[PDB]
Structures are given as structure tokens and as C-alpha cells.
From a paper:
Although the stoichiometry of the asymmetric unit is 1:1 for ZFC4 to dsDNA, the ZFC4 chains are not evenly distributed among the DNA molecules, with one copy of the dsDNA lacking any associated protein and one dsDNA binding simultaneously to two ZFC4 chains. Comparison of the refined dsDNA structure with ideal B-form DNA showed that ZFC4-bound DNA has a compressed minor groove and a slightly expanded major groove. T919 forms a hydrogen bond with O4 of T9.
Mutations in SALL4 are associated with Okihiro syndrome, and SALL4 is also a known target of thalidomide.
Residue numbers in the entry: 879 to 932
DNA sequence: GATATTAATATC
DNA sequence: GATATTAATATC
């Protein structure tokens, strides 16, 4: 029953609405300790993290 | 919240 | 065109 303010998207988790707000604003709180790439979700940062590790 | 999934994008 | 990466989001 969560909704969004900048656009009209309903969300499931409240954390989901928070990350999607980050999708509007540009807050990418997860910093790659190797390269400087920053990410919205921790999972996306782990995704990228796999890249240099191999 | 973590993870998996799809669509979109950068790299070649 | 193929492939790797990313961005956003459904699913658990
Ligand atoms: Zn929104
Ligand atoms: Zn990195």
C-alpha cells in the first residue's frame, strides 16, 4: 500500500519505496571499495563487486 | 532485506 | 550482433 511522491508508483516493501526514491534522486549509498562506482542497492554493488574479483 | 529477474545500456 | 554490465524491480 506504499506509494511514491515524485511519480505514481506503488511499492511492496517500505525499503522498496526508499530505494525507488533513491532511483529518483540519485542517492547511490553503496561505494565500491575497489573502483569508484556507486550503487543504489547493496545487491547491485555485490553484483558489480563480482566483476574485478574474477 | 536479500536475491533473483527483466529490461535497458555500455562495451566490444 | 554478441556479450558483459547496470539499473530498476518482482519475488522470496
Ligand atoms: Zn517514484
Ligand atoms: Zn568496482
Amino acid at each position: 500500500q506504499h506509494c511514491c511522491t515524485r511519480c505514481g508508483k506503488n511499492f511492496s516493501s517500505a525499503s522498496a519505496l526508499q530505494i525507488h526514491e533513491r532511483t529518483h534522486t540519485g542517492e547511490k549509498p553503496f561505494v565500491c571499495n575497489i573502483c569508484g562506482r556507486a550503487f543504489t542497492t547493496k545487491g547491485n554493488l555485490k553484483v558489480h563487486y563480482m566483476t574485478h574479483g574474477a
